[PDB]
Motif scaffolding. Structure first.
Motif, PDB file in Angstrom:
ATOM      1  N   UNK A  99      31.909  43.424  30.315  1.00  0.00           N
ATOM      2  CA  UNK A  99      31.379  42.475  29.436  1.00  0.00           C
ATOM      3  C   UNK A  99      31.561  41.836  29.122  1.00  0.00           C
ATOM      4  N   UNK A 100      32.600  41.605  28.691  1.00  0.00           N
ATOM      5  CA  UNK A 100      33.326  40.614  28.579  1.00  0.00           C
ATOM      6  C   UNK A 100      33.541  40.015  29.929  1.00  0.00           C
ATOM      7  N   UNK A 101      33.856  40.210  30.698  1.00  0.00           N
ATOM      8  CA  UNK A 101      33.732  39.288  32.014  1.00  0.00           C
ATOM      9  C   UNK A 101      32.879  38.849  32.530  1.00  0.00           C
ATOM     10  N   UNK A 102      31.834  39.945  32.030  1.00  0.00           N
ATOM     11  CA  UNK A 102      30.818  39.630  33.329  1.00  0.00           C
ATOM     12  C   UNK A 102      30.551  38.067  32.148  1.00  0.00           C
ATOM     13  N   UNK A 178      27.978  50.512  41.004  1.00  0.00           N
ATOM     14  CA  UNK A 178      27.863  51.787  41.333  1.00  0.00           C
ATOM     15  C   UNK A 178      28.386  52.680  40.966  1.00  0.00           C
ATOM     16  N   UNK A 179      29.430  52.356  40.594  1.00  0.00           N
ATOM     17  CA  UNK A 179      30.303  53.057  39.797  1.00  0.00           C
ATOM     18  C   UNK A 179      29.743  53.403  37.975  1.00  0.00           C
TER      19      UNK A 179
ATOM     20  N   UNK D 125      21.497  37.679  38.323  1.00  0.00           N
ATOM     21  CA  UNK D 125      21.059  39.165  39.038  1.00  0.00           C
ATOM     22  C   UNK D 125      21.654  40.224  38.884  1.00  0.00           C
ATOM     23  N   UNK D 126      23.081  39.941  39.020  1.00  0.00           N
ATOM     24  CA  UNK D 126      23.759  40.957  39.910  1.00  0.00           C
ATOM     25  C   UNK D 126      24.175  40.685  38.194  1.00  0.00           C
ATOM     26  N   UNK D 130      24.450  44.524  35.526  1.00  0.00           N
ATOM     27  CA  UNK D 130      25.475  44.787  35.527  1.00  0.00           C
ATOM     28  C   UNK D 130      25.062  45.300  34.326  1.00  0.00           C
ATOM     29  N   UNK D 131      24.519  44.291  33.202  1.00  0.00           N
ATOM     30  CA  UNK D 131      24.068  44.265  31.642  1.00  0.00           C
ATOM     31  C   UNK D 131      23.106  45.345  31.581  1.00  0.00           C
ATOM     32  N   UNK D 132      22.649  45.691  31.978  1.00  0.00           N
ATOM     33  CA  UNK D 132      21.611  46.617  32.238  1.00  0.00           C
ATOM     34  C   UNK D 132      22.451  47.995  32.041  1.00  0.00           C
TER      35      UNK D 132
END
Lengths: 195, 249, 97, 201, 49, 195, 49
Positions: A99-102, A178-179, D125-126, D130-132
């Protein structure tokens, strides 16, 4: 007499096998060498039952267990992936780091491999889940043990003089959506088993 | 036209979308989501809450600094109690005191806090309160950045809020003729004896477990302060050192 | 008011089972622990640095080796003091920061 | 005040554990923070804290109380009244209240930290997908029984990426202890006495 | 953040208003075009009669 | 990519890399797979700067360094092979096993009869050269720790029901025998001197 | 889409006019004035300093 693979190619492949991953930001020469003969590297990995993924956007080249006939049960059974399997507390910490990375990725785009976080920010997070033994030193020791074990998998640089660490870009591919869905389905399964 | 207008203010959502018919769908989808969040309605509540919380933090910190200053001022009384026991000259004992630093930074902080307190009452939905809080936090951040400057220490460091002064007291009366503060006098021997004496007294007080007037670790180490001192003033130094309960090397 | 009467025994049942202070007063070894803890925090108000606290505790416990009627550390009082500080942190009697 | 300190710890921890809730819109999180802080303020210990805070605005009275305390404990009767520990505590009670209230403010700032963390989520978007996924996973995580040992060290099906092969056990990499380090140093405990005459004139 | 949300909603609402107005106009014009297609048959019936 | 290497061949190669050796006595199938596929095996090892040394009479297969001499320095620093230096006790046990296995190979011939020894025979010698750690129990614990570690390096087996181990043929190819025997001579010299 | 973009990047040279075709004269006058005068003049001032 007999053929010798390009000495530089041998260096790059052995180094990438040793560290399991290879980043342009700190090892550009071998990174490019592999990028110059990716067919060669992939062929080299094929006997090993390994494979090479790529992410030029962040500048990573990481090893991954091949899947041609690999048992889908778990690639971890492969005899040469020496580091042990991940566990769910490590997985919670992995989720927080992802989460921090994104968040950092949004902030600076792909920016640089320096996606940093101060350790003091992790303590409030894990406090909610792993508990609160009420001793700051004890929770810090637990957090540092988790971070060290993660660095064993290569997802975070060890703590430094500023108590800061850099989430390695490899994280993005371990917590691939996906993972994430796979692990999430399994976690819902376990929550159901909690009944 | 209005689609382009919306893009001019967008941040992170409309970026993926163009400014034509096919993009209207996502525009209105995010408009629906934004209205669902209802965030714009909170404005006044959150502004006033921010005012309250940041005011609490700032005022608490400033009062904490002031109380640190008072703790130091009482430490001065403690050491004065220790120093009254021994003589600096045959008929005199040394005593301390403190003045309040007058400085530009502290004065500006005072003015800003005056404005902040005056800014609570203004019936303006907390806008003036926010302005005063912003300027005060600006002062605090500025000081915390350039800490080595005199003003920053005067603000955030307790002891620099005070000027330390030393005087020589009449044993039998309140009579006083001496003052080492503001203008040190620059005496090449008197400053040395004064400093060594006050340091010895303070060091003894620190070395003595509470209650006892006698240090538990009697040993002290000293140096060519004697070389800067004459014979008579050096003898005064040794006498004072012995009288405070200190064995020395 | 009788509703409070019926509900109250739930409150006291919970506290006797849960709240730290009551559990401490209940335990067989309560007086020694309470006296030692009072001794420690009494002489300072800033919160003891952990090393200083554990040293002072190992000093206090040595005085109570004469109190043979409850546990006496035969070989290493410092280990005993460290263990007791760990335990009292575990019981939420003392939180360190 | 020690009790107030716990009340604010728990309010903040509830705010965090609720912030994990995926369904919470940003407005919902803002509303929860505001309402929880209001409720904590209104409760009795909250009123105690609020009144003490108002005393800080009217600082001259707290300063006068501390000054009077100073004048009180100096009087000879005070010596009989209490041991030195109690005199020390009472005089610096005014400061001690200031210190303790600071602890609550730390919790409030900490909570504002996570509020700020959740404000910025205009994800690509991506990133949004991933946040969801991550919020769902974390919500699922709360319900596990973390305190138990065995829960924490259970394996997870996360795939192996970044895999590194290491420690290839070639026998030829072996080296052995070599004992050339045994160079001994004498323990010269003799008294290296002085020679007074050598001293200069 | 709250300020920017307010501005974004304020600017976006006119977009939705204009969109709905244009949608109304567009259904009206689509039906009106459908009317133009029926005109030949009506006058053809009248001509035959 | 192109077709795969034989699954059996890759399995044997990965086994040989995990253990550093293969045996006809316990794994004759992978052993004969590697032998019947030597060119392919060495080609797979070629990118790694690896190779397989062999001894058919001893039923021994093992990995060995393919590196060129002094490409960076005269002493090889193969990235995928860390050169651990054992502690004194392990070195003493290594020398004991080397000499005893050599003697057994003189008695029965080279690799003709498995070399064997008993734990009870070993313990007194370890006490003689090292000294009593404090009890027989500690001596047995230390000996078993040493044996477990060396077995990790493939040097020794585990004790059987009678508590006898078999010396692995890998011992015949240790790097610095001169160091081993010089250390043994110095150890006997020092036990003679320190009394 | 073009002229709206120009008004956003504008710096007080186009705010006086809107985003319709009737404003085209001001758009073009500003365009030519800036292209011919502003660019060379500013570049030469920058170079001299």
């Amino acid at each position: 007499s007999e053929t010798r693979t390009l000495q530089k190619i041998r260096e790059a492949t052995q180094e990438l096998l040793k560290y399991g991953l290879l980043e342009e930001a700190s090892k550009p020469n071998l990174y490019r060498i592999v990028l110059s003969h990716p067919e060669e590297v992939t062929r080299i990995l094929e006997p090993l039952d390994l494979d090479i993924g790529i992410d030029e956007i962040r500048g990573l080249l990481y090893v991954k267990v091949r899947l041609d006939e690999t048992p889908a049960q778990d690639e971890w059974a492969h005899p040469l992936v020496r580091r042990q399997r991940l566990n769910l507390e490590q997985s919670l910490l992995v989720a927080i780091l992802r989460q921090h990375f994104v968040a950092w990725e949004q902030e600076s785009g792909t920016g640089a491999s320096q996606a940093q976080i101060a350790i003091d920010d992790l303590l409030p997070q894990l406090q909610i889940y792993l508990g609160d033994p009420g001793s700051e030193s004890k929770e810090r020791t637990r957090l540092l043990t988790l971070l060290d074990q993660l660095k064993g998998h290569g997802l975070v640089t060890s703590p430094d003089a500023h108590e800061r660490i850099v989430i390695r870009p490899i994280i993005a591919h371990l917590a691939d959506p996906i993972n994430l869905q796979a692990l999430l389905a399994w976690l819902r399964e376990q929550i159901a088993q909690q009944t | 036209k209005r689609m382009s207008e919306a893009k001019r203010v967008d941040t992170g959502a409309l970026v993926e979308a163009g400014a034509d018919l096919d993009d209207i769908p996502v525009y209105l989808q995010r408009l629906q989501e934004l209205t669902e969040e209802a965030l714009p309605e909170k404005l006044n509540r959150f502004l006033d809450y921010l005012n309250r919380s940041s005011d609490d933090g700032v005022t608490q910190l400033l009062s904490h600094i002031e109380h640190e200053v008072l703790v130091i001022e009482e430490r001065l009384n403690e050491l004065n109690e220790t120093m009254f026991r021994v003589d600096f000259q045959p008929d005199r004992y040394l005593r301390l005191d403190t003045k309040k630093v007058v400085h530009e930074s502290l004065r500006t902080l005072e003015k800003a806090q005056r404005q902040l307190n005056a800014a609570r009452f203004v019936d303006d939905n907390g806008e003036s309160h926010y302005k005063a809080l912003q300027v005060l936090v600006a002062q605090l951040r500025d000081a915390s950045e350039r800490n080595r400057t005199l003003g920053a220490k005067a603000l955030l460091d307790p002891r620099f809020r005070l000027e330390f002064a030393v005087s020589v007291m009449d044993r039998q009366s309140g009579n006083v003729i001496e003052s080492r503060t503001g203008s040190q006098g620059g005496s090449g021997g008197e400053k040395e004896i004064i400093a060594s004496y006050v340091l010895t007294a303070s060091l003894s007080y620190a070395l003595s477990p509470a209650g006892s007037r006698y240090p538990l670790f009697g040993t002290i180490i000293l140096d060519e302060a004697f070389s800067r001192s004459s014979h008579a003033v050096a003898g005064r130094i040794i006498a004072a050192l012995r009288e405070f309960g200190l064995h020395a090397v | 008011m009788e509703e409070n009467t019926r509900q109250r025994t739930e409150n006291y049942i919970s506290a006797k089972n849960q709240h730290p202070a009551w559990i401490l007063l209940a335990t067989r070894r309560a007086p020694l622990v309470l006296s030692a803890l009072k001794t420690l925090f009494e002489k300072s108000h800033d919160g003891i640095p952990l090393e200083e606290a554990i040293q002072s505790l190992s000093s206090i416990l040595i005085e109570h080796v004469s109190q043979e009627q409850y546990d006496i550390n035969q070989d290493n009082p410092f280990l005993q003091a460290s263990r007791e500080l760990r335990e009292w942190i575990k019981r939420r009697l003392i939180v360190e920061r | 005040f020690r009790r107030v300190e716990d009340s604010w710890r728990e309010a903040d921890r509830a705010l965090r554990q609720s912030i994990i809730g995926e369904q919470y819109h940003r407005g919902d999180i803002v509303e929860r923070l505001l309402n929880d802080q209001d409720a904590l303020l209104n409760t009795p210990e909250g009123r105690v804290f609020d009144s003490f805070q108002q005393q800080l605005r009217q600082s001259s009275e707290l300063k006068a109380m501390s000054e009077r305390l100073r004048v009180i404990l100096s009087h000879p009767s005070a010596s009989d009244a209490l041991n030195r520990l109690q005199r020390h505590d009472l005089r610096w009670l005014v400061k001690r209240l200031v210190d303790e209230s600071q602890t609550v403010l730390q919790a409030r700032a900490r909570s504002e930290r996570d509020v700020r963390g959740f404000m910025k989520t205009g994800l690509a978007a991506e990133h949004h997908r991933v946040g969801h996924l991550l919020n769902e996973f974390l919500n699922l995580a709360l319900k596990l029984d973390w305190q138990r040992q065995m829960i924490r060290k259970q394996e997870v099906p996360l795939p192996a990426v970044g895999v590194a092969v290491t420690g290839i056990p070639a026998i030829e990499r072996l080296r052995f202890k070599e004992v050339d380090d045994e160079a001994e140093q004498t323990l010269d405990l003799s008294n290296h006495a002085a020679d007074l005459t050598q001293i200069g004139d | 953040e709250l300020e920017t949300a307010r501005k974004q909603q304020q600017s976006l609402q006119p977009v939705a208003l204009s969109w709905e107005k244009y949608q109304k106009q567009e259904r009206q014009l689509a039906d009106w075009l459908t009317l133009e297609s029926l005109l030949p048959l009506w006058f053809a019936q009248q001509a035959s009669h």
